Amino acid sequence: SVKLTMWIMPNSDTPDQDLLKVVKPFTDANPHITVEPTVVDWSAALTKITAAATSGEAPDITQVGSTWTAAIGAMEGALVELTGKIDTSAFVESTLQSAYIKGTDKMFGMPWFTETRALFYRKDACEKAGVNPETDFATWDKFKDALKKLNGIEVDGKKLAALGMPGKNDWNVVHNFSWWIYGAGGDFVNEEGTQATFSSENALKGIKFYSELAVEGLMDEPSLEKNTSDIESAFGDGAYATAFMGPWVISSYTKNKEENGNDLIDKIGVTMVPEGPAGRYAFMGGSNLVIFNSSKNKDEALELLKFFASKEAQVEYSKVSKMLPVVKAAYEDPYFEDSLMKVFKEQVDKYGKHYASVPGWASAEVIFSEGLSKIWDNVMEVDGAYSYDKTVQIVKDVESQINQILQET
Numbered sequence: 001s002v003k004l005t006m007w008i009m010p011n012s013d014t015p016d017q018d019l020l021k022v023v024k025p026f027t028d029a030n031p032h033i034t035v036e037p038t039v040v041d042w043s044a045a046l047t048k049i050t051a052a053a054t055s056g057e058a059p060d061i062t063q064v065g066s067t068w069t070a071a072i073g074a075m076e077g078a079l080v081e082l083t084g085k086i087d088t089s090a091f092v093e094s095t096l097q098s099a100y101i102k103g104t105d106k107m108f109g110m111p112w113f114t115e116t117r118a119l120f121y122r123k124d125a126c127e128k129a130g131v132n133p134e135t136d137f138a139t140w141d142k143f144k145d146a147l148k149k150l151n152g153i154e155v156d157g158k159k160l161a162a163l164g165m166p167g168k169n170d171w172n173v174v175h176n177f178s179w180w181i182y183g184a185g186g187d188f189v190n191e192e193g194t195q196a197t198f199s200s201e202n203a204l205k206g207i208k209f210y211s212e213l214a215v216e217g218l219m220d221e222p223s224l225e226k227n228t229s230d231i232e233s234a235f236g237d238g239a240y241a242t243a244f245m246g247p248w249v250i251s252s253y254t255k256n257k258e259e260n261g262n263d264l265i266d267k268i269g270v271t272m273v274p275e276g277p278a279g280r281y282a283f284m285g286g287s288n289l290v291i292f293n294s295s296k297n298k299d300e301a302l303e304l305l306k307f308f309a310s311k312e313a314q315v316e317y318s319k320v321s322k323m324l325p326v327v328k329a330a331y332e333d334p335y336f337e338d339s340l341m342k343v344f345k346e347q348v349d350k351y352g353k354h355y356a357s358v359p360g361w362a363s364a365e366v367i368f369s370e371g372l373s374k375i376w377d378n379v380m381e382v383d384g385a386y387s388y389d390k391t392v393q394i395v396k397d398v399e400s401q402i403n404q405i406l407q408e409t
């Protein structure tokens, strides 16, 4: 007998159950293998995985944020090198770069699922505001015009803010800036992933355009006090006409209707992020699976990773979590005719961009999460009036620390 244990990060209200619903076909076909999941929340996962990699007090397998894979894989003796042990031909090509350490041929993770952030909107709010959501969000400038018409629009006598986005420190702080920087024609690092470049003229143009949506009263300023989960909940309670969110919120809003009669789910659509002067760009994230080098059943652990990559497990995991599969064949399933999920798939395939898969990137995100949240503190005027000039200084200070981190490699 073999007791396979794995850590998972939560994106639903029942993560352990969702997972067991997906691996049940595997366990029914391998009676000598048991699988026990354990939840590790996102804010603790990097610290916990890093500690477990060196102490050996670890499960056999852990989910890992795609942007962290290289950081963990670069830890000597931390993970099983998967190079050649998994068949990557079946995978969506673009998902594989985050499974390797950039500049090496070393694959330390297997892509598990993909996610991007799309523009959710209230159909009823748009109709009343005279906003056509199929056309009026297409570009930065049209998006901004639409927000002005949606600002303070009322549905059933309650005012909505035009755009609700979090500003508090969680991992999504940098993710929510990413595609504004990209769409302006900037990037976080050079091609090699070895120096920071997000104080460039173009990067700052994107930072200024996005952050000043709140200065101008279009993005809701009080919501910048809150984190992603709180703003997701607020949108589900009707607080905002629009919000940029991942696909998993659809599970939450569907449950809110089933349990509470909250019909928000029936009032929303989703469209791609607005196009900037560089063309359209979107955040590409998701998670990979890795096998700890300390695993005493690497044969079974590797067997379980291959099952998670099977067409049926990918379809079923996508159904329960709303995440996108990383296996091309899953998308032939009728389920992906869904009007909302189609948007996330088209956006990530055509316009998705993932960070450089470098070992220092995980540590960089810690600095991004604290550093860039100071931009929202500036906008929120908690220490003096807002000024763009203070944002520029915040960004330059973050860049210096990122460069020192990248130089450790």
Ligand SMILES: OC[C@H]1O[C@@H](O[C@@H]2[C@@H](O)[C@H](O)O[C@H](CO)[C@H]2O)[C@H](O)[C@@H](O)[C@@H]1O
Pocket (backbone or CB within 6 Å): 011, 042, 043, 064, 065, 066, 067, 068, 115, 170, 171, 172, 228, 246, 284, 285, 286, 287, 365
């Ligand atoms: O930056 C770490 C990893 O973040 C992942 O995004 C998570 C979101 O899906 C979730 O909704 O919120 C948490 C924070 O509470 C985010 O960490 C990305 O999918 C990964 O690509 C990324 O490595």
